[PDB]
Symmetry: C3
Amino acid sequence: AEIYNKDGNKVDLYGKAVGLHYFSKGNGENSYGGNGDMTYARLGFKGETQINSDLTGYGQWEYNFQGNNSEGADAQTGNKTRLAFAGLKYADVGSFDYGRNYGVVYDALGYTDMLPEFGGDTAYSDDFFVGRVGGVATYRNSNFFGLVDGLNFAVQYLGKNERDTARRSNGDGVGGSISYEYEGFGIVGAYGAADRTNLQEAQPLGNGKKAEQWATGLKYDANNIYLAANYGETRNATPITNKFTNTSGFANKTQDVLLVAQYQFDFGLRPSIAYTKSKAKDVEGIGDVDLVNYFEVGATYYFNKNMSTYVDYIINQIDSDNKLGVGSDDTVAVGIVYQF
Amino acid sequence: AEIYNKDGNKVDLYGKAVGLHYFSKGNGENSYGGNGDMTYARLGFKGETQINSDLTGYGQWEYNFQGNNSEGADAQTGNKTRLAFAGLKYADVGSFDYGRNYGVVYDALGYTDMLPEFGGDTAYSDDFFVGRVGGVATYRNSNFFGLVDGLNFAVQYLGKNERDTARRSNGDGVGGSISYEYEGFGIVGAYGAADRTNLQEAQPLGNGKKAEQWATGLKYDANNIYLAANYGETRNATPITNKFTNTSGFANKTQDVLLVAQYQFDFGLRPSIAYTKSKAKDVEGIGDVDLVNYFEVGATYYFNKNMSTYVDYIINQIDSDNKLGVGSDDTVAVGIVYQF
Amino acid sequence: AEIYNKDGNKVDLYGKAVGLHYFSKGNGENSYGGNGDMTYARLGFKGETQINSDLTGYGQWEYNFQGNNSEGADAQTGNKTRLAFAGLKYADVGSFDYGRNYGVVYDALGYTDMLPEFGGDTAYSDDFFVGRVGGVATYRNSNFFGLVDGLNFAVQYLGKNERDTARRSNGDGVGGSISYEYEGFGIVGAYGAADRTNLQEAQPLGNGKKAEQWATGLKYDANNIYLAANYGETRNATPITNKFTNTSGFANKTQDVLLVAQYQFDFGLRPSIAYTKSKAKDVEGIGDVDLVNYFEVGATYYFNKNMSTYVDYIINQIDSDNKLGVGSDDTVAVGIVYQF
Ligand SMILES: CCCCCCCC/C=C/CCCCCCCC(=O)OC[C@H](O)CO
Ligand SMILES: CCCCCCCC/C=C/CCCCCCCC(=O)OC[C@H](O)CO
Ligand SMILES: CCCCCCCC/C=C/CCCCCCCC(=O)OC[C@H](O)CO
Ligand SMILES: CCCCCCCC/C=C/CCCCCCCC(=O)OC[C@H](O)CO
Ligand SMILES: CCCCCCCC/C=C/CCCCCCCC(=O)OC[C@H](O)CO
Ligand SMILES: CCCCCCCC/C=C/CCCCCCCC(=O)OC[C@H](O)CO
Ligand SMILES: CCCCCCCC/C=C/CCCCCCCC(=O)OC[C@H](O)CO
Ligand SMILES: CCCCCCCC/C=C/CCCCCCCC(=O)OC[C@H](O)CO
Ligand SMILES: CCCCCCCC/C=C/CCCCCCCC(=O)OC[C@H](O)CO
Ligand SMILES: CCCCCCCC/C=C/CCCCCCCC(=O)OC[C@H](O)CO
Ligand SMILES: CCCCCCCC/C=C/CCCCCCCC(=O)OC[C@H](O)CO
Ligand SMILES: CCCCCCCC/C=C/CCCCCCCC(=O)OC[C@H](O)CO
Ligand SMILES: CCCCCCCC/C=C/CCCCCCCC(=O)OC[C@H](O)CO
Ligand SMILES: CCCCCCCC/C=C\CCCCCCCC(=O)OC[C@H](O)CO
Ligand SMILES: CCCCCCCC/C=C\CCCCCCCC(=O)OC[C@H](O)CO
Ligand SMILES: [K+]
Ligand SMILES: [K+]
Ligand SMILES: [K+]
Ligand SMILES: [K+]
Ligand SMILES: [K+]
Ligand SMILES: [K+]
Ligand SMILES: [K+]
Ligand SMILES: [K+]
Ligand SMILES: [K+]
Ligand SMILES: [K+]
């Protein structure tokens, strides 16, 4: 909510409280999403200052507070900063920001990342260009320097992050995206490539000096209708785990497909259906293997812009003999959300 | 403080900074509260949206930031989310919320939880129904569907939380409360029972498949006077430690009594006296033993609704030969509070 | 930003988002500041209530969120409360506050702590009187009871903090400062002494029952010109370590000098140059050794009061064979800052 607006600067303090519970058979270890309390809250700020008629500065920070920990030793589990960045934007010239922000391939993956609770499976955090990541410099242009309404593009430099785990590390890289969005119609392409670190190359799963991710998307988003599809491929970039050898690494190759269809009734009910499949190829000791494979059915009821409730049912198509030990059981989430 | 109120939604951002110090002889290991700096701060939001004339949605998050840690490796000690939940309240039919919230037995223990600093000794956090707890679904009714002013009841479902420690864990359970309040007089009773997890049963102290907690309360709150008392008992629910054998678990039985008397002078000073005693029975290898036993004298001076200062003296009646090694020395707390 | 002001209470919710990157050769281990992404955010509140015409109450809390961590196991690295205190101020009698706050010798060190990104090297956190510390009670007096404009002094009591590390510990102590400012000129002095804890005394480096810190300062601060010098000495108070081994402790003596010169152009550019040298003496097994030794050239460009950008170049004079393994390579920081 806008809590401040004076003398050229405005500040939006926002957040939400989500009462959230997952249901899956047994103890949830062999299911899509687990089971139990999944309650959490968010808090963030977003600010924008008018420097002159054409130039604006901005900054944003957003944090995740888990609500399903005790007040004991596990208190901090799953807590983190999601975003933290600042930037400048000028009229029709474009914008530039640096910090922790979305990687550019998410410009495409956002198309299908629309489910009430799940979905968006290939948009991993700290995974090069497909999700939120640290140390990215991003230039964006809207409406092609003012010449073409609906045409956007972006260019992004990812600085290396040599962390303690292969999973969360990355080398230097660059990526970009282009989209055209007009009267409800949208089409997007995005690509990114980067060096892998020594720690990454040392894991038994995944082999290569460079990581690559790309995706395309199509959508129609108008008249209470939302339809969208994504297709993309990755090289040495999707994190995986072989549960039978207790080993982790990256998929040599993946091909990823996502589909979503939603409809919003005037009285506030928004039913949702979706399909997601991500498969890995040339995985050491395995070959081909599904990582994600399901149909979704769900719905959100919007009381208003501040309050909603939802159910999200994942009909999990992973098989009980999945070679990596990916969970094969269904999961249903039920949530109630206050937000501001 | 209300920092947003527009289009049917209002948001309160609140918090406080508490400069706080405890004094006890020695290093304070053998005292009621310990000694040293105990400064902390809090931040939270509380939101309420009017959905229509009969229906409101709401959400709340609250966090504790310790102010007595270094900026080094102990930085996070004692920090946690206290509350995180969202809910709906309908006309005279009731409210429902889910998330991290107060267990229903605290509906009773709230009566004596009124001391400037100490007190409320039996309202443990992450302990089934007596304090803040994770994954509780709570139904509350005010004025018995509109028919009886002052008559309230609550029914509460506690989802299991199989955590890393027995102390912070619980199995599935249900609880309830009922209270009548009128013109300053209050009377209340509350009860809940839950399964214990495998990890709790495996602890050396405490035996049985079910945990139970109940309490009764009476109070008078009006005319500058506050008088209240609680009596309750627990089974397999109160966490304890044998400091001699470094063993932990739960007391097979406790009975608990709390008394408080307070008076508020118009000029700001509010003296307080209290008595608190919690005793355990059938404790493995010990039998009967007092967990808590003291008289309290203290006072708060309110400068106004935002600034106050207080002193709180605990005259500890625990004996130096206590069988569980519960601290016997006194503690005095001194605090200065700014809040918003 | 002031987000609430009503009925004699006002609340400032403030913060910033800083995209920040450091460049140093190799992996940054042997450099002044390290290398890589250093992005972070701050959030805080500052509140003030008018109790009566002469009496005011106040509280402040301030927190650092690192933006250069992943969302995995390392998420909390470097996160901490910086300040948490509350207090009262009366007419021309003075102010008193208690909690986590700045030690009084920082009243002197503030003179040179003015660089775009670095500098202020001797104002250590959790280090007796030179930086932020927990459990300090501080009296401050403005304009000598209102009789001498520009004359200010402070007296401070530091309660003991026995922590798990000697680095972050302290015993009881007292300090004070005094300063005079007239027509752009300022002179300041500050001194503190305190007991060392047993754990501090057990460390291989540094010998004595008392830690002492003092610093003097001169500045000229007017007509867009900023010039300042600090001279100070410490005894058993400056923390030191050998980079290559476990040996750690405090320097028996240090001699500290800091110089700064800056000019603020009306259009927004503020170039900066500086010199900092901190040298330890009588170090067990070593004798004399430089802790800090550098020249700085940098600049901040201010778009307005909410947006700025900077570069800060540390030209490191520390030698590659420094006895304590102090990093010898340069570091440059580049930053973009949105604040409210
Ligand atoms: C119009 C929308 C109104 C719809 C409101 C619906 C309320 C849903 C309640 C879910 C309870 C959870 C039940 C537990 C589900 C079983 C776990 C599971 O999915 O696996 C079983 C197996 O797959 C065979 O289906
Ligand atoms: C798989 C990757 C797919 C990527 C696909 C990216 C789309 C690229 C579009 C380029 C040029 C389109 C030219 C559009 C020129 C429009 C001219 C104009 O500005 O008119 C607007 C209209 O008249 C206002 O009403
Ligand atoms: C006085 C005025 C000063 C003007 C200063 C203007 C520059 C502003 C830059 C903003 C953010 C800089 C963010 C830097 C992002 C680059 C990340 C990077 O360089 O990665 C390196 C790679 O990992 C290994 O070489
Ligand atoms: C379970 C799987 C089911 C999911 C199925 C997903 C199908 C995906 C389609 C993608 C893009 C569609 C692009 C269609 C282009 C729309 C343009 C259009 O129809 O314009 C109408 C106009 O606005 C009227 O006024
Ligand atoms: C548009 C209005 C309609 C609202 C639409 C969304 C709300 C419904 C949610 C419930 C879905 C329940 C269906 C789930 C049952 C599937 C279980 C299953 O098939 O999986 C078994 C597994 O294979 C064993 O091995
Ligand atoms: C489109 C319409 C959307 C419809 C949405 C329907 C309800 C929504 C929200 C309610 C959340 C309440 C969650 C309550 C969780 C209680 C269950 C529980 O605690 O289970 C523990 C477990 O059984 C241990 O064994
Ligand atoms: C451990 C003990 C637990 C006990 C828990 C409490 C039990 C309460 C029962 C409620 C009775 C309702 C009697 C009060 C009804 C008042 C009459 C009425 O209906 O309204 C009055 C009206 O306001 C004119 O002033
Ligand atoms: C079930 C448990 C119930 C517990 C019951 C707790 C109350 C106990 C009272 C004892 C004596 C009562 C003596 C009351 C003395 C009142 C004196 C007084 O109030 O004077 C009035 C004055 O004229 C105008 O303020
Ligand atoms: C350590 C010493 C602390 C001991 C504290 C124990 C007191 C317990 C009281 C319990 C219930 C109080 C019920 C009393 C109800 C009286 C109602 C009343 O006073 O009526 C006022 C009248 O309506 C307008 O003058
Ligand atoms: C009803 C009115 C009650 C009046 C209450 C006034 C409160 C004033 C200030 C509060 C806290 C200040 C605490 C000061 C603590 C300083 C450190 C200290 O005293 O001790 C360190 C320890 O002794 C090492 O041996
Ligand atoms: C009105 C009430 C006033 C209360 C506030 C007054 C505090 C101010 C102290 C000034 C210090 C200026 C510098 C201190 C001088 C350094 C002492 C010193 O040189 O110590 C020697 C060292 O041990 C090697 O011998
Ligand atoms: C041995 C001696 C060596 C000789 C070296 C001398 C060379 C001087 C260089 C000055 C450059 C910058 C001067 C800028 C002029 C200041 C104008 C000004 O500052 O006023 C405008 C406002 O301050 C801002 O917008
Ligand atoms: C913006 C208006 C124009 C203002 C322009 C201001 C330029 C100021 C230069 C002073 C530099 C002092 C730096 C001193 C460096 C000494 C260190 C040294 O002697 O050696 C470093 C060498 O790089 C080791 O290899
Ligand atoms: C809800 C409590 C009733 C209100 C009382 C107000 C009396 C005021 C002062 C006396 C307090 C001591 C009496 C409270 C003791 C509770 C019962 C108890 O402690 O246990 C003995 C009992 O016979 C079975 O255990
Ligand atoms: C040489 C110092 C400038 C380097 C800054 C790096 C920022 C990078 C890109 C933005 C440049 C826009 C700033 C160019 C300076 C414009 C000065 C101006 O117009 O503002 C003056 C002031 O507002 C009157 O009050
Ligand atoms: K490999
Ligand atoms: K490969
Ligand atoms: K399946
Ligand atoms: K047991
Ligand atoms: K038992
Ligand atoms: K005692
Ligand atoms: K020593
Ligand atoms: K010494
Ligand atoms: K400017
Ligand atoms: K050097």
